[PDB]
Amino acid sequence: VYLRLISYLKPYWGVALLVLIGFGMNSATEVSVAKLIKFIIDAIQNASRADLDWFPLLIILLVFFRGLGLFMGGYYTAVISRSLVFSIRQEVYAKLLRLPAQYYLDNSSGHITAKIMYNVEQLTAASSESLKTIVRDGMITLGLLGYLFYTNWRLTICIAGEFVAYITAAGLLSKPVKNLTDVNEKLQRGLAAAHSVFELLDLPEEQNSGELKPQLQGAIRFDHVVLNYADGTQAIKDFSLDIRPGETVALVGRSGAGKTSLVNMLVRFQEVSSGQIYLDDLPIRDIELSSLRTQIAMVNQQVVLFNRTVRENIAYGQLHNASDEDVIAAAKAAYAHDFIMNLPNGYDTVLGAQGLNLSGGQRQRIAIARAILKNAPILILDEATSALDNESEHFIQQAFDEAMQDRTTIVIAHRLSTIENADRIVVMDRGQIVEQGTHQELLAKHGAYYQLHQR
Amino acid sequence: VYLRLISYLKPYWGVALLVLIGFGMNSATEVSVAKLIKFIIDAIQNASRADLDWFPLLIILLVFFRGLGLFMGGYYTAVISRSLVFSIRQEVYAKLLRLPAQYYLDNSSGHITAKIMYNVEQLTAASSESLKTIVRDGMITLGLLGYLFYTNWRLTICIMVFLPIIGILVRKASKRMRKLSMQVQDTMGDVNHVVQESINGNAVVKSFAGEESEQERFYKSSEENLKRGLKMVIVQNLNSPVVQVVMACAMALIVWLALRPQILGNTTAGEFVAYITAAGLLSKPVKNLTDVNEKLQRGLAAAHSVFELLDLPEEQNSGELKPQLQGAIRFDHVVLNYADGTQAIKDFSLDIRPGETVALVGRSGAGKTSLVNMLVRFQEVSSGQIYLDDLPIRDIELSSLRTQIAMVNQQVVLFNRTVRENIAYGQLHNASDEDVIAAAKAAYAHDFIMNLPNGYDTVLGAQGLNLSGGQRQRIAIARAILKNAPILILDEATSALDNESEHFIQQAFDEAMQDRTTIVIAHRLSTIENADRIVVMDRGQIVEQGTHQELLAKHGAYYQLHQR
């Protein structure tokens, strides 16, 4: 699988010609050591005083050239290694963002952060070390073998100062050739990790089949929403979900319902392959992933706040449109300004300490404030998992109602009172909808009354 | 770090003496190379003819000794490094459990365990390479320098002048490298946290956001890390050449007056060549000895693993006793209040019978699962005494209390190594492989592991193997069975409702339920039906426990049974 690794280095053939020069000069020095040792024998035998006294300059020059070659070769191998690991890390992160997010369910965050970081370092370290040692090995072996073949010709039968030079140049093969038989160890160690990252380097991908920029419709119509849980069994049976613009409809489901799974289909998450979502001649890929994500803003019950400055969390989805007046209006709309402004100054709160500054209620209020400030054409409200009782429970409920009244919203039945206050209520049990129309008919039938009393 | 690391191979006194001899005899041969070339020069200069017979035998014997010494030394240092790393892994595995409730609860051990294992493996590689290099190169350098002293004692200016400057230069370089490694580690932590909080926050980034902002933030952090690393490796790859040049300059200087005219070393012409050669033999080993500085000091700096266990309090387990199989972990009038939050369980006196199946019925995220998991030091529980088997649980040691209890969690029990190491017990010698395999054969997960690759003949536990949630849950169940703990806690929500091995999983669970007491929280109707006795708790408090017939008779419990 190492073949594709060369493509990531193909940017760097301009600098890869310097490491060859460096290790070539290193090999030249490690061959010329034999030249020097042969030189001294003849100098002593013939008592050639001039070069004999000149010898220390030869030693210093040889070691300096060896050092320069090793320095530049090693540094440029390091540059290749670091730039390669940076490029691989950036590309794998870019792809890992796009993936359809079912990978996130079964694969925990710990495994992903272990992979994307340690695995790539292991791969690049093994590859760089193997390449460095194989280049050094090959070039020194070529130089020394040429030096041997220059004098004593053949050596296959076994397998004055000139004799000394030959035996030295033959002995020098010892450590390089020992590296030769050891490269495969590092290569296989790198192989053990390469498949883990390179397989994820493609690992399928989510795309924008519709490829339509315009998505300011505000109307959603879903027909026969049937999804099979990992192709083993249907999560929810067929149901018709037609939502008119502006109007808000409340959805109530029994135990085992898709709930967040059903809503996520409307947000281009876990797209329903078995479905008939067609509104105003728009297919399942109505506009695009980015367009459908921007036009519809959800309020997740999990409520996750990034460990960054409050400036970053205030305008995550609207970076250019970051306005102080808009942020103030959002803080007024949802009763969260007091919680943010109590501990820090407020303009730049800089949330930190692993979220210890703000409690869970303040975090939920901040999430609701961000959802309100999104002001998307369509919103999905889901707060069932949140605690019913809170210090600012009434304020949070009022903020949620104000956000729902802004545009079209389909509730996830966070509270029984909220569902009752909703004008339109639709109930689907086990994937089958038995309640429809005005809430007066449902109240008269009392079908949802028992569920509300139980919950 | 060195002081504590030394005490980890010190008890292995027997294996220590048998690794040094190989590198010592290697150094002896390497030194004898100079004596050999001294032999050759005077053999060629004079009319000696027996050299034609001496030389091949001497070369063959030297090669044989070098090969034998290197092989023996490498194998023995490999086994020593492996044993040391196994000891580190055993110590961290024992001490991973019971490090405060907040530390385990907040991080959920999903990333902490991975970070710890990564640090341990980095220390593994660094220690192995550094130890091999330091021992071999030190022995060869000391032996060769001893030869230098023996050959010409009066030549001592090489020790003088330059060598202290070389030493202080090396120390300064090491200090500067540590300074750069500090910033490298800082950027490492920053980018790690950015990536982790991006992973946990995919819902927000896809709901109302664009990936480009997060991509730019990650790009900035990664480029800063790149620049710091390039500066660090500038320092690294520049350290060795300059020290090589300065020491070689010192050697040339001492040779110059050692080769001064009208002395010529009394015109020996054989000893001087041997000395020059032996001095040249220093080049590569000393270069390796300088280069190992980076690896060793990077390992030391990354050795925060040796510090994580050094900082841990344990005061509750002051009973100085281990009840082992208590048989009943019960709490009377147990009420625990979270910090800056309402109490999850109030006026709860739940008790666990010996060997009786117990389950918790409640909504997702309710207090039932929290109360069930509260047995293993989930909360301080300062208010409200809890006594198990008519004795407070603080008497038992924290390690003993944790080990005696068993929990089912695929994420927590997931070793990033081969499946054989995945079911590794407390001790290597305590648990025989054959018995563990036979016991785990009841779980019927042996076929699932064997179908993908071969854990016995090849490394297992890859991404594909870990992606199977059912396989991971079955492996954890098998490990718990091999533990033979008195109390077992399991979650049926993680397990797939419908699967090919669902019937086998249900049969294995039914078989295991009779063996030992289970307080497993069951989210599946199959386990509820298999449960003879069920505990129903509302808002963290259980009014009473009734049988299946009693639950069916009561309308409120019948509705819950019909729902799930």
Ligand SMILES: O=C(Nc1sc2c(c1C(=O)O)CCCC2)c1ccc(Cl)cc1
């Ligand atoms: O003669 C040998 N090796 C030499 S001679 C010399 C040097 C070396 C070396 O170890 O690189 C270093 C530079 C100065 C002169 C040798 C001969 C036979 C074997 Cl079976 C192994 C080694």
Ligand SMILES: O=C(Nc1sc2c(c1C(=O)O)CCCC2)c1ccc(Cl)cc1
């Ligand atoms: O003595 C050293 N280097 C020499 S002197 C010499 C030679 C070499 C060599 O590079 O092998 C080759 C044969 C002729 C004379 C030396 C000593 C200490 C260090 Cl830290 C590094 C190098």
